[PDB]
Each structure stands twice: as C-alpha cells, then as structure tokens.
Amino acid sequence: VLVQTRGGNSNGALCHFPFLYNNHNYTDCTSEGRRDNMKWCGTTQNYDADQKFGFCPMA
C-alpha cells in the first residue's frame, strides 16, 4: 500500500509507519484526532517529539 499526503503538517510528504502518536505507536492510519470518519497518519517517527501529521488517502 502507499499512504501519501499533501497539506497536513508535512508540507507534502508520504505518511510512514509505524509512527509513534502520543506514545501510541500506530502502524497504520487512525481517526482518533478526527471528528468525521477519514483517517490521518503521522509523517515523522516521533509525533510526541515531532508534531507532524498527514492524511491517509487509501483503503
């Protein structure tokens, strides 16, 4: 699969996995920070120390 994003805090980067999100190593996309339904993903390897996310346009 290929999760690429463009607009989040990555200024145009490909989401990566696994990605620590608030001490929550997520090896995929998650909608815990959304209130609609889609799912986003971190673009860094340490969200707790990076603060960079993106979207997960995929299935």
Ligand X SMILES: *[C@@H]1O[C@H](CO)[C@@H](O)[C@H](O)[C@H]1NC(C)=O
Q: How far is the CB of 24 from ligand X (least distance, A)?
A: 6
DSSP 1-59: ---B-SSSTTSS-B--SSEESSS-EESS-B-TT-SSS--EEESSSBHHHH--EEE----
Could you tell me the smallest distance in angstroms from the CB atom of residue 29 to ligand X? 17
Which residue type occupies 55? F
Binding site for ligand X (CB under 6 A): 20, 23, 25
Q: Which residues pair with 14 in a beta bridge?
A: 4
CB of 37 to ligand X, least distance (A): 26
Which residue, 23 or 37, has its beta carbon nearer to ligand X? 23
Nearer to ligand X, 11 or 25 (CB): 25
